[PDB]
Amino acid sequence: KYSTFYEQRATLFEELPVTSKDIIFLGNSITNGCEWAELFQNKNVKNRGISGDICMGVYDRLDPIVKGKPAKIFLLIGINDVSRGTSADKIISEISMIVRKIKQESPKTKLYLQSVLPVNDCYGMFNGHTSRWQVVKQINDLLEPLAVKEGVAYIDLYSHFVEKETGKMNPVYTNDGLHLLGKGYLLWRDIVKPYVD
Amino acid sequence: KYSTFYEQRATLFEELPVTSKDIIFLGNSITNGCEWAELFQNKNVKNRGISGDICMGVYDRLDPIVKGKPAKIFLLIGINDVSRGTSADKIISEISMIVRKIKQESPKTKLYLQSVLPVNDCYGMFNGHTSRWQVVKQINDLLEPLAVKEGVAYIDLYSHFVEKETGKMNPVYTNDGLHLLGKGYLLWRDIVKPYVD
Ligand code: NA
Ligand code: NA
């Protein structure tokens, strides 16, 4: 069901042009689930999220995005690779490939690496994801130095969504332990709005 | 997974305002899967689709849409009720409730009833949907008179997507027998673009 949905969205994305004014939100279902243009009241903000996507899935569909030379790319990816048992090291290594590809194909694009969001097992759903809540911090501990090493920005969403007493996502923003309710996207908007306009 | 995703999208929709200039695309995953504003290059076009949605699910979340008094509503719903074994009669009866609610809460809104799209069992997926491909025609045969009886428009997408020799969807537009590839959304755009601008 992922590969067919991936192909549906990816072939649609190849028909929608990307211009140099565009602000791209790129990632998996946490990106897919939002109406980003409405959330920011900005016609230039475009959704390139695909539910279920992994790091190499994003890498393989970069061409219709970088060929447009967009203004900004906000990237949030990785949690689905955690659910497959992939280590934080390999995930960082695959995110590094995405960063280098973008920097070489579109050097004027501003790239923003967003921290992987925390998860919570309290609702008993997506146990492949939520049982590995400790890996989220392992990834972000490596993701921020990668951003500095490559000269791109790092956005700490994690600290605003997490409960410091548990290390898991605050249940007020989620109904399944992984995805966001409307209130979760409003918090996300408040954090990244300065980077958008 | 449907009820949690339904709540995620519905609570997001309650935070996104609807204005009198807006053109709303309302329905299930076939509506959810498109970036409608990009497809028409129109900032006023907004996505209100929810994967898995049924007729009463649409009915129950009408308030944040009709309270904005939008300019146009394009509705495509029903195929998920077919997969649950519901008869065409009851589906038409529930679509009638949606039409009356919209006409009473926002009488200036132009409502466009779109034909249910054909399905195809050739890919062996979504057998609850694709095994009942004959019900699609039963619904559209009742849906067009309902549109005339209520003074709203009926848009025949079915005739452009179907193979006349089979009564099922042309496989060139789908990779699973139910959802659309990018080429399918381009055909949809060509059919309804006159009704949008
Ligand atoms: Na909750
Ligand atoms: Na096909």
Alpha carbons B196 and B40: distance in angstroms, whole number: 8
Residue B160, token pair as written in the block: 């452009």
- Measured in angstroms, the CA of A122 and the nearest CA of chain B are apart by 14
Amino acid symbol at B136: V
Q: Which residues of B touch A37 (CB under 8 A)?
A: 37, 43
Look at chain B and report how many structural domains it folds into.
1
A174 is in an annotated binding site: yes
Across the interface, whether the CB atoms of B183 and A13 are under 8 A apart is answered no
Q: How far is the CA of A186 from the centre of ligand 1 (A)?
A: 15
With beta carbons less than 8 A apart as the criterion, state whether A135 and A78 touch: no
Please name the helix (run of DSSP H) or strand (run of DSSP E) that holds residue A72, with its range, or none: strand A72-76
- Measured in angstroms, the CA of A28 and the nearest CA of chain B are apart by 14
With beta carbons less than 8 A apart as the criterion, state whether A166 and A134 touch: no
Across the interface, whether the CB atoms of A4 and B179 are under 8 A apart is answered yes
Q: How far is the CA of A16 from the centre of ligand 1 (A)?
A: 35
Q: Which residues of B touch A186 (CB under 8 A)?
A: 15
Boundaries of domain holding A35: 1-197
Q: Which residues of A touch B169 (CB under 8 A)?
A: none
Count chain A–chain B contacts defined by CB atoms under 8 A.
Answer: 74
Candidate from B8, B180, B183 with C-beta closest to A180? B8
Number of other residues whose CB lies within 10 A of the CB of residue B191: 15
Show the 3-state SS of chain B: CHHHHHHHHHHHHHHCCCCCCCEEEEECHHHHCCCHHHHHCCCCEEEEECCCCCHHHHHHCCHHHHCCCCCEEEEECCHHHHHCCCCHHHHHHHHHHHHHHHHHHCCCCEEEEECCCCCCCCCCCCHHHHCCHHHHHHHHHHHHHHHHHHCCEEECCHHHHECCCCCCECHHHCCCCCCCCHHHHHHHHHHHHHHHC
Across the interface, whether the CB atoms of B181 and A8 are under 8 A apart is answered yes
B97, HSE (Cβ side, Cα atoms, 13 Å): 15
Query: What are the residues whose beta carbons fall under 8 Å from the beta carbon of B165, sequence distance 6 or more?
Result: none
Please name the helix (run of DSSP H) or strand (run of DSSP E) that holds residue A153, with its range, or none: strand A153-155
Residue whose C-alpha is closest to residue A35's, from B98, B64, B197: B64
Q: Which of B6, B7, B13, B15 to mutate to test the interface with A (most CBs of A within 10 A)?
A: B15
Alpha carbons B6 and A150: distance in angstroms, whole number: 39
Measured between CB atoms, does B5 come within 8 Å of chain A?
A: yes
Buried residues in A146-178 as b, exposed as e (16+ CB within 10 A):
bbeeeebeebebbeebbeeeeebbbeebbbbbb
From first CA to last CA, the distance across chain B in angstroms is 36
- What's the DSSP call for residue A66? H
Candidate from A14, A125, A180 with C-beta closest to B182? A14
A123 is in an annotated binding site: yes
Q: Which residues of A touch B19 (CB under 8 A)?
A: none
User: Which residue of chain A comes nearest to B40, CA vs CA?
Assistant: A16
The neighbouring-strand residues paired with B47 are B25
SS3 for A109? coil
Alpha carbons B130 and B119: distance in angstroms, whole number: 6
Q: In Å, what resolution does this model reach?
A: 2.3
Alpha carbons B86 and B54: distance in angstroms, whole number: 11
A171 is in an annotated binding site: yes
Measured between CB atoms, does A125 come within 8 Å of chain B?
A: yes
Q: Which residues of A touch B9 (CB under 8 A)?
A: 33
